[PDB]
RNA sequence: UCCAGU
């Protein structure tokens, strides 16, 4: 499909995430926009998996605390084009059933 | 608006 699967390092990943962007932003943008902070070790857009069109948000991520702390110290509260940005540490490894089994 | 993907 797209992107690349999470690394085999979830046993110590910093798991920072990023959201709140616009319905007009795109993942190639956030990939490069956040790559400068050190390591955009992952990025995703779980918009849907049956209609793939919500695109109202994204999930940029980091795996090292030094680049993750800067990423939120400089993107939390920013403005893409007229709304706010959000970035903070995750709370789960991944959703348990958003795609059923 | 916490991932459903190499």
From Swiss-Prot:
The modification Phosphothreonine is found at residues 22, 25. The modification N6-acetyllysine is found at residue 52. Residues 14-92 form the RRM domain. Extensively phosphorylated on serine residues in the RS domain. Phosphorylated by SRPK2 and this causes its redistribution from the nuclear speckle to nucleoplasm and controls cell fate decision in response to cisplatin treatment. KAT5/TIP60 inhibits its phosphorylation by preventing SRPK2 nuclear translocation. Acetylation on Lys-52 by KAT5/TIP60 promotes its proteasomal degradation. This effect is counterbalanced by HDAC6, which positively controls SRSF2 protein level by deacetylating it and preventing its proteasomal degradation. It is found in: Nucleus; Nucleus, Nucleoplasm; Nucleus speckle. The modification Phosphoserine is found at residues 2, 26. The modification N-acetylserine is found at residue 2. Induction: Accumulates in a hypoacetylated/phosphorylated form in response to cisplatin treatment. Belongs to the splicing factor SR family. Interacts with BRDT. In vitro, self-associates and binds SRSF1/SFRS1 (ASF/SF2), SNRNP70 and U2AF1 but not U2AF2. Binds SREK1/SFRS12. Interacts with CCNL1 and CCNL2. Interacts with SCAF11. Interacts with ZRSR2/U2AF1-RS2. Interacts with CCDC55 (via C-terminus). Necessary for the splicing of pre-mRNA. It is required for formation of the earliest ATP-dependent splicing complex and interacts with spliceosomal components bound to both the 5'- and 3'-splice sites during spliceosome assembly. It also is required for ATP-dependent interactions of both U1 and U2 snRNPs with pre-mRNA. Interacts with other spliceosomal components, via the RS domains, to form a bridge between the 5'- and 3'-splice site binding components, U1 snRNP and U2AF. Binds to purine-rich RNA sequences, either 5'-AGSAGAGTA-3' (S=C or G) or 5'-GTTCGAGTA-3'. This is Serine/arginine-rich splicing factor 2. It comes from Homo sapiens.
